[PDB]
Design a binder for this molecule. Structure first.
Ligand code: BEF
Ligand code: BEF
Ligand code: BEF
Ligand code: BEF
Ligand SMILES: [Mg+2]
Ligand SMILES: [Mg+2]
Ligand SMILES: [Mg+2]
Ligand SMILES: [Mg+2]
Ligand SMILES: [Zn+2]
Ligand SMILES: [Zn+2]
Ligand SMILES: [Zn+2]
Lengths: 514, 513
């Protein structure tokens, strides 16, 4: 290697000769200077790896030297090594983007620690992530194997996502080894769902929490305990997207993290209507035929969610005051943000955000989103940018100021599809690549989850359709009339409505304002 | 509220003085004696910060760190230990500790660490606010008077720096800077309009511009017998460079500089000028086979590789070189594989294209409006695209080849605000910031007006063909449906006119570490 270079500025550098010898023995080149002006010049005309800085020096002070050095080379770490214990100096150093602040007398090893932490942090963390994943990779495969409970599935998926993000900043083949494990997880999760889905619908008392159960399990207990709640539903928000925005929200909230199961199809007109109605889609139609819109109509499929909310509140003999707001466009979030505090009168404030859904679909037809979200790390990254720079960030921030509980959840996720499944003859479901509705559908029954009795899984259908077929894993339906184009166009896009961990196992977070 | 600290040390009884000190300072400390006790405490509470001994009976502090970061990844952990072994330091760093303090620890060092890890964001805001209020004065005197080109580069670099710094500060301070930026752009437009003709007419005395870029910044390197990668990112302005330079600092050291794009600040003219070494006009007369009239339907920057060849010929050089355009991040994969095969050449040209902001597709329009509503968001998208596209590894891999890299752009872009009325035919171009026209109508005091394109190296078809250019953050708007197109194009990013963002663009000479 080459040695890391250290520029050290102190009016009494002679008193630090022992420390300089120690660092020089550990492979570091130290250039000493005696003033801020000499340190500034050295930084200007050199490319030092790190800068050590005294505060009290004849001439300009370290805090003033720090400002200049940060404008010249803001990416260069600066450590303040001073005898000052004044809080004012600490405060201004932190504010000046100091990397470390060490109070004299300093143990030389404390300087070694700063040098490693501030110059080799990334490679150290990278090597530990690989090492830790190598240790735990086996434990994850076996944890996967066998017959897992629902709660065991939650923790496994939680563990897989964690490694998805950790291994972004680590070795490649560790990352593609995780992809294999994730692939195997989705396969085994698919069997878990198809073997139990009909029973889940049949026996509502022994089933995991699903869309129709969401409000009863996670909202009503809060409201019944006297608490004021903001139910915020970001449509098409996967588990790994929650993990991406989690740290940002931690500045303002504490979390109780949970997950729950979306119903099939993992689509908005079914799962999200089931949430706000508290019922399986078929039960919405029977009990409230005026609020259900069947898949044929050109009318909107989720325009009646507020009335559904009122029937659910009434259906459990609750008297909650509530509001419902639906946000698509950029301007309407700023407007809702402006009128946010007028909602303080209501116990329950429901907010639906549709942009991640829009963006997720734009991964198919928008060259721009094909660039910004080429892979799932970019998609997560792009989700961070949106959350921070849209009005969503300050919306969550204003709610916290209002002393409101927030239940942050979604209706379904989405998955990056890879391999086609042939199909033909459906009705009006060509728009969805993960589920299909119709009669006389030619397909391979081995490749899908067949629902020939839709009313058994709480699904309505008009007389021109009698069955549902769902994809599994990362498959997507493809027609043969324009097959080769169809396949090249939709491969690697994001699609929902089928069976996968990404689509079905989705977050529900109960957040308390700090 | 009081900040809460979880402190796990098997000798917690000897740390009672530190604890009392910290309780006097307003913190609530919870003492525990082992890694398992701490793990359980974190599991059932929301502590703000964790202090962690390493050597304890039971599990080691390092084992506790791994589990606590799993439970509360967003909670800072400070290791406070007597151990001075290097492998312990390294392992704790790997375990994502916030700090590592070797015993005995100054109690003020605990306080500092609590400020730096629990209140650093709000501290940086107040400090940035206070610093800028003071620097606001020097930026006023620095843009006062008549500035030289070198002074315009310093000032523009200064304004960009504070633009990004003030992302983390009070809104009012950003408003205050926004107006200093307005004034800078107003004065910069005067500076350009008063000198642009002189610059084109006197090549030996002008600032470095598009047609001079290769001679000024590339040929000297090669002539000094050093290999070079010339990477041109389309529509990559100064603050986008400032947004990605830290990522690049892990593999390069920088010689940062700027240069002026010619007008229009549009790929068809500026980038062709860079590669041809000539002005867009004299492209056609010097080289008919190379030029493409703007009015031809097929692409205009497809035969740039031959333009580069004639440039090498004109200056009597014999560089072996390559040329590669990467439209999409998928094509970049192939280039990344074959990238080491380009070690044979002295010069390697790569054209990268950042997301098209000219997209009229309804979906792109809806994305753009939400993902890039302001300049902070635009920079954030820029960083995201750079890291997760093939661009990041591309620079990473070129560094391993030990090549010098010249990173630059052909022009920038600006967020437009106010409409400027203009009347023209169906023929007239779509660009919001500049028009070409046989019969253009406009307030000549609202634009930079080039009645004879031929004098400034621009082509034309008719005697009556003009070029007109917007300044500051103006954008052209036609009378038909003027009210609608004003509302649609306002706050969108455009290029082709006169502004610091469009015109004064980065050129970085980078040395692999
Ligand atoms: F003089 Be220094 F601040 F220790
Ligand atoms: F719009 Be939904 F997520 F199908
Ligand atoms: F016992 Be601890 F590591 F100081
Ligand atoms: F023609 Be480029 F988009 F400026
Ligand atoms: Mg001193
Ligand atoms: Mg002084
Ligand atoms: Mg101990
Ligand atoms: Mg032990
Ligand atoms: Zn949805
Ligand atoms: Zn959707
Ligand atoms: Zn361009």
């Amino acid at each position: 290697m080459r040695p890391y270079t250290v520029l050290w500025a102190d009016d009494e550098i002679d008193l630090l000769k022992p420390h300089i010898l120690f660092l020089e023995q550990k492979g570091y080149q130290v250039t000493p200077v005696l003033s801020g002006n000499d340190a500034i010049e050295a930084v200007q005309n050199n490319d030092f790896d790190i800068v050590f800085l005294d505060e009290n020096m004849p001439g300009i002070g370290g805090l003033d030297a720090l400002q200049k050095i940060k404008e010249l080379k803001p990416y260069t770490p600066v450590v303040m090594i001073t005898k000052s214990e004044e809080e004012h100096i600490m405060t201004q150093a932190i504010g000046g983007k100091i990397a470390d602040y060490l109070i004299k007398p300093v143990n030389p090893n404390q300087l070694l620690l700063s040098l490693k932490k501030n110059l080799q942090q990334h490679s150290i963390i990278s090597e530990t992530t690989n090492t830790n994943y190598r240790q735990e990779f086996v434990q994850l495969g076996t944890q996967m194997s066998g017959k897992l409970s629902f709660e065991e599935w939650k923790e496994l998926y939680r563990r897989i996502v964690f490694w998805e993000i950790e291994l972004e900043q680590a070795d490649r083949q560790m990352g593609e080894l995780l992809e294999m494990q994730k692939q195997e997880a989705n396969r085994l999760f698919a069997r878990f769902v198809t073997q139990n889905y009909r029973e889940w619908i049949a026996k509502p008392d022994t089933r995991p929490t699903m869309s129709p159960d969401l409000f009863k399990q996670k909202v009503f207990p809060l409201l019944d305990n006297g608490e004021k709640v903001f139910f915020i539903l970001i449509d098409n928000f996967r588990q790994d997207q929650w993990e991406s925005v989690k740290s940002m929200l931690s500045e303002f909230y504490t979390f109780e993290e949970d997950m729950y199961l979306s119903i099939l199809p993992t689509a908005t007109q079914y799962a999200r209507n089931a949430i706000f109605s508290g019922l399986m889609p078929l039960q919405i139609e029977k009990m409230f035929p005026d609020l259900w819109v069947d898949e044929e109509s050109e009318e909107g499929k989720n325009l009646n969610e507020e009335p559904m909310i009122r029937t659910l509140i009434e259906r459990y003999r609750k008297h909650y005051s509530f509001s419902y707001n639906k946000v698509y466009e950029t301007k309407f979030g700023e407007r809702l943000l402006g009128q946010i505090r007028s909602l303080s009168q209501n116990q329950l404030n429901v907010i639906v955000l549709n942009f991640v859904d829009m963006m997720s679909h734009a991964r198919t037809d928008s060259k721009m989103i094909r660039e910004l979200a080429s892979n799932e790390a970019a998609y997560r990254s792009l989700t961070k940018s949106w959350f921070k720079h849209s009005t969503t960030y300050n919306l969550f921030r204003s709610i916290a100021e209002m002393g409101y509980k927030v239940v942050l959840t979604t209706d379904h996720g989405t998955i990056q599809v890879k391999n086609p499944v042939k199909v033909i003859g459906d009705r009006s479901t060509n728009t969805n690549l993960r589920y299909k509705i119709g009669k006389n559908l030619d397909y391979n029954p081995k490749e899908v989850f067949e629902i020939k009795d839709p009313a058994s899984v709480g699904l309505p259908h008009n007389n021109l359709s009698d069955k549902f077929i769902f994809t599994k894993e990362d498959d997507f339906f493809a027609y043969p009339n324009n097959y080769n184009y169809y396949v090249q166009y939709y491969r690697n896009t994001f699609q929902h409505g089928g069976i996968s961990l990404e689509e079905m196992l989705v977050p529900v977070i109960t957040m308390q304002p700090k």
